[PDB]
């Protein structure tokens, strides 16, 4: 049966400079509970890692631990300055995860949408991402 859980990731000192931020950044690990040993993390490319996504921030869900079979649906959103879910993007189906496999969206959010202060998505250079994971595995 599906087990649904979530993780809120606050990235501090956010910068679009690859030489300061890194090409890839990763969150701490999370799971559905203290008893759940399957560990996940989020991975962000502050600038998309291919030509197609270069004007985007790319966001992925990564299975970190070695599962004892695993499939999961996922939904990513950005939390605004008021704390609300904005710019949600979700998988249409569950995908197969093995240790080290990621799934996500290379064009999750346009960089210039984040740099537009009216949207309130980078207050104090903190980017707050929220992931909801549905593991049917």
């Amino acid at each position: 049966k599906v087990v649904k859980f979530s993780y809120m990731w606050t990235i501090n000192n956010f910068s679009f400079c690859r030489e300061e931020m890194g090409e890839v950044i990763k969150s701490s690990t999370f799971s559905s509970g203290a008893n759940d040993k399957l560990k996940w993390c989020l991975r962000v490319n502050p600038k998309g890692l291919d030509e197609e996504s270069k004007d985007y921030l790319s966001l992925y869900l990564l299975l970190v631990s070695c599962p004892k079979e695993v499939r999961a649906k996922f939904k990513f959103s950005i939390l605004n300055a008021k704390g609300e879910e904005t710019k949600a993007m979700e998988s249409q189906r569950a995908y197969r995860f093995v240790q080290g496999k990621d799934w996500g969206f290379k064009k999750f959010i346009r960089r210039d949408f984040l740099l537009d202060e009216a949207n309130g998505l980078l207050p104090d250079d903190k980017l707050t991402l929220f992931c909801e994971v549905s593991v049917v595995q």
């Binding site: 991975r43 890692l49 992925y60 993007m89 979700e90 998988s91 249409q92 995908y95 197969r96 995860f97 093995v98 080290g100 496999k101 990621d102 799934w103 996500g104 969206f105 290379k106």
Partner: peptide, 11 residues
């Protein structure tokens, strides 16, 4: 929106 992966296949 269709999901992508940074790697080809599993795996």
């Amino acid at each position: 929106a269709s999901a992508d992966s940074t790697t080809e296949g599993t795996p």
